[PDB]
Amino acid sequence: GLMQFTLPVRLCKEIELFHFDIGPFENMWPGIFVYMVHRSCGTSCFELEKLCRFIMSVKKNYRRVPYHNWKHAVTVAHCMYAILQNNHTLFTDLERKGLLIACLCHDLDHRGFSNSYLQKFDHPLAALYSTSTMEQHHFSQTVSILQLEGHNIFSTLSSSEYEQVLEIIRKAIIATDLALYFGNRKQLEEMYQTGSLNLNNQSHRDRVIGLMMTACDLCSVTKLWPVTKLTANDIYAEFWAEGDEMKKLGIQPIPMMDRDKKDEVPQGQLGFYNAVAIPCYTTLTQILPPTEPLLKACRDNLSQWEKVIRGEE
């Protein structure tokens, strides 16, 4: 009960900042996550024996893909940690517990292919889950791991508290389906602007947690430019593999997934920042003012991509 995780001084300080990068030492990432749970939630939130066994089974069920890997899991959980730490009093005990776990689990057993590619391939998961295919799978893998012997990190919750947290995790993980983000943010925009947004309305909280999940999932675009630029390589490595697999099914992929159209990446990033990222962190900053550093970092990166296009890099 008296066993705190501590970090070296540089990490202890920078882990509190939105733009923190967890580093290239995989063996420190479990301790980084436990450190964040303990400070976000408490040293009592979970039995350490069970949490450690949970973390290591989750790690094992992430695959060795360029981007949708164990590093992404921990990175997305860190962005959620920064949001929660900058909005201390807005979230319940159950929500702080649920959301760090949802983030760690949100891409379990990802193969590096989109929902689209699964549907065109006619993958069995596309027959089992007609929409949000991978996300329903990620939630399924999360429940599977929670049910392994010694892995039920929620055992100490009441029956109804257990149902509530599993329901937060399910909605949180389904919300990472970017196809759902557009309508979710549009509705949050209207509610915020007509003044009807009400954090005591469960349907509204659900929508705000949804947008936090998009914000954390896209957080590559809110890092310092060298981290953003090097992560873009990993992202495009999966996109180009998917485009290659489209060409194998005899389907010309969209240009974003065609490795013969790498020249178009900088302009593809502009569209993405303007159509997705900036609108996302803008609405997030309206609802949760202390998350403004994410919007500022995102605009800084938009400006860096504008500079790549102007051939200034």
Report the catalytic residues: 68
Q: Is 246 in the site for ligand KIY (CB under 6 A)?
A: no
Compute the distance between CA of residue 151 and CA of residue 155 in angstroms, rounded to an integer: 9
Compute the distance between CA of residue 228 and CA of residue 207 in angstroms, rounded to an integer: 27
Q: Is 244 annotated as a binding residue?
A: no
Region from 72-80, 118-126, 215-223, 281-289 binding ligand KIY, contact rule CB under 6 A: 215-223
Q: Is 110 annotated as a binding residue?
A: no
Region from 14-22, 79-87, 99-107, 292-300 binding Mg ion, contact rule CB under 5 A: 99-107
Q: Is 242 in the site for Mg ion (CB under 5 A)?
A: no
Question: In angstroms, what is the minimal distance from the CB of 272 to ligand KIY?
Answer: 4
The residue within the footprint of ligand KIY, chosen from 7, 52, 157, 178 (CB under 6 A), is: 178
Q: What one-character-per-residue DSSP string does 82-150 give?
A: HHHHTTGGGS-HHHHHHHHHHHHHTTTT--S--HHHHHHHT-HHHHH-SSSHHHHHHHHHHHHHHTSTT
CA of residue 264 relative to chain centroid, distance: 26
Q: Is 38 annotated as a binding residue?
A: no
Q: Is 136 or 220 the residue whose CB approaches ligand KIY more closely?
A: 220
The residue within the footprint of ligand KIY, chosen from 75, 115, 222, 269 (CB under 6 A), is: 269
Compute the distance between CA of residue 138 and CA of residue 161 in angstroms, rounded to an integer: 21
Contacts of 190 (CB under 8 A, 6+ apart): 196
Q: Which two tokens stand for residue 200?
A: 């005591």
For residue 313, the 8-state DSSP code is: -
Q: Which two tokens stand for residue 150?
A: 């010694």
Instruction: Using CB under 6 A, list all residues that contact ligand KIY.
Output: 178, 218, 220-221, 235, 256, 268-269, 272
- Binding-site residue numbers for 3',5'-cyclic GMP are 68, 269
- Binding-site residue numbers are 68, 72, 106-107, 217, 269
Instruction: Using CB under 5 A, list all residues that contact Zn ion.
Output: 107, 217
Instruction: Using CB under 5 A, list all residues that contact Mg ion.
Output: 107, 176
